Amino acid sequence: NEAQAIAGDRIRMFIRFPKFLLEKIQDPKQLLFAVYGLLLHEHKNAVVNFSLQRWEQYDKPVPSQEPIVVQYGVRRYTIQPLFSQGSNSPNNVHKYERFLHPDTVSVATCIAPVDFTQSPA
Amino acid sequence: GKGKPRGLNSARKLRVHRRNNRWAENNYKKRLLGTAFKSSPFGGSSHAKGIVLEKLGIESKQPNSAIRKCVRVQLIKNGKKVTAFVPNDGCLNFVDENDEVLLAGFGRKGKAKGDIPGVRFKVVKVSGVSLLALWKEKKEKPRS
């Protein structure tokens, strides 16, 4: 509903740009960088609970109380999750399962600073 | 006299007689009024593809005892909302909503295989790729 500034066009905006974070923001005619957008309350953050499968032909397990760099989408955060069984849960009540299962679905539980559009993690 | 005229001028009656008794047959009246065209959301087709609306809420018209991983779908040739079904059931992980299927009946134009209202259409091919070489662990079996 609250979509006002028109996409499709070209735009010249005065984006306030801090002097702190001026190491790796470059001018890509030959290099690779991109820039994204935010929301109102995406400025706030929340607590997430992922669904994870094991990667295919990736047999060896990982203990699941350990910092894994989570992407849900593309961007990277070394989040400290809590995997729990990804069964069909009627009551939506989970476990503090410590570690992983080598085949089935896992449900992470962690705090992440949230990008709310259901991506393949 | 067996309740009928017989005499060899009476055919005037008879082809008007059966003409008014074909309507007591069922598929005759179903057919010659275009009821398959004014209804039956395939519209006389054999398949239809459409986006999955969402996960489905189970309303018991008996009996298959679980949340049957079924998919509310709405077609794109018509846009008429039907509850659907996947066989080889489970694996609720591998497509989002608003995503493609290919629908086909159960064998009676469905109407009954589990406790779900109006579930009569097996999904054949999600997003153009099949299910039978996708339950075969080549590819992966979708979600709602």
Place this chain on the structure above:
Amino acid sequence: KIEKITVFESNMNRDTLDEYAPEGTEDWSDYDEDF
């Protein structure tokens, strides 16, 4: 200021520049289970 080369500011009705919710410290007072 959002413009085209129509001026749209970064107006007042916004979440100020927090990351966790600033009402969250006060939300550590809903003593739901004092177990």
Place this chain on the structure above:
RNA sequence: UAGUGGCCUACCAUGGUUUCAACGGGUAACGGGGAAUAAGGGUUCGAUUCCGGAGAGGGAGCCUGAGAAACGGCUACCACAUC
């Protein structure tokens, strides 16, 4: 008119069709051999290589010509839509 003819036109007559179904309505209706049939009859389909009809997006209209109400011909309207 190439010609019969209410095809018109001018005066006349009051007729004509029909429960032996007029008229009106619907057709996911282009009509004829084909198909699935297979005891026989019945049933349903026929856009489709052949015959006949129709149209060149929809209606008009006219030229040239033995022949066209022609559209890889033309004029106009209507719907589009290029530099």
